[PDB]
Amino acid sequence: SSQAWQPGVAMPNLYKMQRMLLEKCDLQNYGDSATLPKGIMMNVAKYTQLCQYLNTLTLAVPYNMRVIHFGAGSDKGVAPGTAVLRQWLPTGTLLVDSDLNDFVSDADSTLIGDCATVHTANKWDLIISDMYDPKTKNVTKENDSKEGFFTYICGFIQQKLALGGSVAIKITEHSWNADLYKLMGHFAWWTAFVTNVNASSSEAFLIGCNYLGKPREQIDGYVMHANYIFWRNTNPIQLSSYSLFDMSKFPLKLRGTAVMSLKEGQINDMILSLLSKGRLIIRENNRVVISSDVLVNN
Amino acid sequence: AFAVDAAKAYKDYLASGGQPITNCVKMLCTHTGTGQAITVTPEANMDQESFGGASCCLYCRCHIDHPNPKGFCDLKGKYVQIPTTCANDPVGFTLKNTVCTVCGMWKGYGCSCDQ
Numbered sequence: 586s587s588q589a590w591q592p593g594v595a596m597p598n599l600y601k602m603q604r605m606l607l608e609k610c611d612l613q614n615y616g617d618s619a620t621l622p623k624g625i626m627m628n629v630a631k632y633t634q635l636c637q638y639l640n641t642l643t644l645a646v647p648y649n650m651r652v653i654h655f656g657a658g659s660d661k662g663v664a665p666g667t668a669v670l671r672q673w674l675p676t677g678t679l680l681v682d683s684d685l686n687d688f689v690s691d692a693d694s695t696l697i698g699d700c701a702t703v704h705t706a707n708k709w710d711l712i713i714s715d716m717y718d719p720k721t722k723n724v725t726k727e728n729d730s731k732e733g734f735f736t737y738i739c740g741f742i743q744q745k746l747a748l749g750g751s752v753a754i755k756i757t758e759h760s761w762n763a764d765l766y767k768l769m770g771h772f773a774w775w776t777a778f779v780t781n782v783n784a785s786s787s788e789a790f791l792i793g794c795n796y797l798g799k800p801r802e803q804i805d806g807y808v809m810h811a812n813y814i815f816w817r818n819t820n821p822i823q824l825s826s827y828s829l830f831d832m833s834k835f836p837l838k839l840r841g842t843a844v845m846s847l848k849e850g851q852i853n854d855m856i857l858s859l860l861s862k863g864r865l866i867i868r869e870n871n872r873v874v875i876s877s878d879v880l881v882n883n
Numbered sequence: 884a885f886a887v888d889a890a891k892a893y894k895d896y897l898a899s900g901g902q903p904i905t906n907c908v909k910m911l912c913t914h915t916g917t918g919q920a921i922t923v924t925p926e927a928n929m930d931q932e933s934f935g936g937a938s939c940c941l942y943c944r945c946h947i948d949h950p951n952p953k954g955f956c957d958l959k960g961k962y963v964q965i966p967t968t969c970a971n972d973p974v975g976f977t978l979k980n981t982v983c984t985v986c987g988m989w990k991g992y993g994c995s996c997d998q
């Protein structure tokens with residue numbers, strides 16, 4: 586485990602290729618906790634390690650980048666993950682966040698409400714989600730694919746993620762969705778990433794890297810989640826805070842990735858290759874406009 | 884003529900021995916930064932902690948109007964550097980101190996301008 590100096594551990598490709606049956610997740614290091622630096626919140630450490638890992642991927646980083654962050658509130662009424670994202674993203678990146686419950690944020694704009702009420706006119710270059718319902722952790726019931734906010738996320742990716750864009754969507758043993766895994770096959774590359782600070786939890790971030798808008802590979806989401814659990818069950822990850830102490834290369838590199846408007850009939854294999862390499866974003870470059878539907882009752 | 888004066892109320896609650904506002908969002912950083920007070924990315928030096936700006940603003944945290952005609956907040960969306968000796972109460976610190984307009988350091992906590 587030279588893994589201890591990395592920000593976390595990504596699901597090895599061979600585990601993605603199995604056909605495992607779904608089992609209960611039973612982590613050897615369950616209940617252990619990493620030693621966080623003095624005064625640092627778990628969620629700051631977690632998002633920092635997520636961003637450190639995203640620095641290793643071929644993310645498209647255009648001028649006037651557009652990032653939306655779902656599940657950004659905390660029971661503290663602040664937005665630690667948003668604060669890390671704003672630290673990480675190039676200055677001038679437009680950052681929108683959202684949560685069911687009210688909170689104070691450093692984002693450029695914040696929407697409060699169920700994510701299903703959120704609509705945006707523009708498309709996005711990066712979607713981050715930490716949405717999570719702790720009631721899914723019922724060990725006494727069958728672990729089926731969950732809908733709720735996952736249904737929204739799947740449609741939001743398909744309708745509002747720019748080609749070439751990327752996502753990081755939090756899942757756990759019980760908080761997961763089969764269509765979302767299937768959607769990972771619509772990116773040039775995908776993984777399930779476990780932060781080293783939270784390695785005693787079954788949570789991971791499902792990362793889709795460079796959206797292609799079409800199935801590149803056909804993924805059975807029930808099988809893939811079973812594969813993910815099998816990997817976690819047989820590969821204990823040593824809790825580690827090490828990468829938090831080296832922040833010298835933290836900021837996301839401003840790549841100035843090209844942004845083009847293209848109609849679907851013009852996305853050829855040459856364009857698909859540029860998208861796949863993190864060298865192209867396809868969307869309009871108009872104004873960013875968002876809203877939350879409000880239900881009016883007595 | 885009536886206006887809630889939350890700044891005065893917090894200073895008075897602090898003086899009476901109340902616990903400072905908690906859960907200000909402390910950032911991981913190198914601690915080799917410029918040390919200026921309010922910056923677009925964390926800039927803590929060796930003697931400072933950097934915090935997400937909104938979580939250190941009394942008006943943001945208490946859900947009340949910001950005390951200026953335009954309602955603008957100059958902490959939200961930025962990072963505030965707090966001397967490590969004062970980091971137990973970032974809200975109180977930003978409320979009680981002033982940023983030097985020529986060098987960008989805190990008056991009395993880094994500003995060199997009148998030596």
Ligand SMILES: Nc1ncnc2c1ncn2[C@@H]1O[C@H](CSCCc2c[nH]nn2)[C@@H](O)[C@H]1O
Binds near residue numbers: 628
């Ligand atoms: N349907 C939904 N629509 C909108 N929001 C939702 C929905 N279901 C759950 N959530 C929200 O997900 C969060 C999970 S904890 C994040 C802590 C954090 C993030 N970043 N830093 N700290 C909770 O706040 C919770 O309200």
Ligand SMILES: [Zn+2]
Binds near residue numbers: 956
């Ligand atoms: Zn404020």
Ligand SMILES: [Zn+2]
Binds near residue numbers: 983984986987995996
């Ligand atoms: Zn000065």
